[PDB]
Prior knowledge:
The structure holds three protein chains of three kinds. By secondary structure, chain A is mainly beta.
Amino acid sequence: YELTQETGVSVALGRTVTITCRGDSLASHAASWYQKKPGQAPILLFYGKNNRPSGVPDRFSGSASGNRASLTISGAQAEDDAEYYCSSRDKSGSRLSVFGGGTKLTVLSQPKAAPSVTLFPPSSEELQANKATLVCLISDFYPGAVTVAWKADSSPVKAGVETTTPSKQSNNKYAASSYLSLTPEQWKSHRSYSCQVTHEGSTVEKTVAPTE
Amino acid sequence: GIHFRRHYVRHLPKEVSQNDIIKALASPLINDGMVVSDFADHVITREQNPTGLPVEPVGVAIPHTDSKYVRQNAISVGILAEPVNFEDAGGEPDPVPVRVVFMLALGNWFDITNVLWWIKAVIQDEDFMQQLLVMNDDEIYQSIYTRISELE
Amino acid sequence: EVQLVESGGGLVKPGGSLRLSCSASGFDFDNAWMTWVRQPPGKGLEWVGRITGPGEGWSVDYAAPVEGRFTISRLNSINFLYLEMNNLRMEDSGLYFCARTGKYYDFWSGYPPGEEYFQDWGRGTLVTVSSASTKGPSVFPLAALGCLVKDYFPEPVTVSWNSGSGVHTFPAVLQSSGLYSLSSVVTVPCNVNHKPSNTKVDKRVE
């Protein structure tokens, strides 16, 4: 990426947070900044030297020096939880534009909530075919960020893993699901399988074994 | 392309105001078909809502308006006999005493930015600026033409 | 008061072509520059290309992964922006946004050609490039009871319980096969509908 942004930043309610955009083209060209929420059109937050579109809150401000552009959010509000993107030229003097990779801003909006992990073994209706699936369901965690690691016996498994990104529920908490694909041979030829869900340092593990 | 003709350079007398300068510099552009017929009025109101550049030793203004009012790229230059006040482009209280006026009638954004960049270099060339205040219209036309030529 | 209504997004095959449209309103379109931007699922915004105005001869610039395959055009009489996409690839999939595009250049600090910024955005139209054939799901029970809706194409599927509480249907996963799967778990002390394949299934969880 021509323009480098931090991947993710957190800020408590009412605190100030600065996120940055870095690239050689910023020494010659100003950056503009965009906010984007899930499912919604991006919005322009400001551009140029000291320009802020009408309707954009005063608390969004930007600065720049050298190869660096910065977006500063004063007293962060709950609705500022979003993705933030910078844009500029891809190189000095270019007619093209480019976006940074985006920064996920988490505004700590509620107390931390450990996730619920249910793990279903492959069903015998599925085994009677020629396939087997483990379904790891993760429910009601905050903030929305979890890591899933599968274990066969005590050894890790990376092949056949498919995991969804976290989704917001109807109670302002998050959920995720992970799937492991196995041929029915390697299902029954192991003692057990585990789904290790890591959330904010703490870990919750569930385990299944080919014995109903 | 940028049209710059010999009659697009002129000296202006000591009794002209901001609005007379704009109209005088716009009339050759109007008469050759480079800008809309009311181009001058749109420069005046855009300037009031400012293009004065405080530079030593000669103050400069760059009046212009929205590209939508330009039919063909052109530039019109005015050399003032006596300094005339333009409001600072940056937004400083003191008015800029101006003696050189670059009227920009550019409709192409890439030319606008190239020309503004060239102007920025030119007005920091003190020998060039001093020359502008003493050369005749043809010499100014030839000097700037050569510089616009080198730009493109 | 600005609206930018994109359309034309849908399922298309790799190597196929697709045309997107954007109807603009609420601003002077004839003099506006216009940009297309895309967001691949799960990724960031990616600038696609931009068409200039009359003073620039409607010239167009394109991003590197797209140049030579995509064409941006416009018809000012009806305030439409177009994106013509040829030889589509899997990685062209995602949400495509049109954006009204402003131009910025600071005299004392600027460098040609200044900077473009994106002052109004549409909601986007979704493009999915896939080789996958329409396939009804296989429904398997999860004896908190669940239901596994595996290997269907394309989206969506709808899952309800006892033909109509406390049910959590999870979003679909997109597998390397090009097919989707999802799960619906309900906690106690299923009705899966795939309209693209006319498949209905009532799997009882014994």
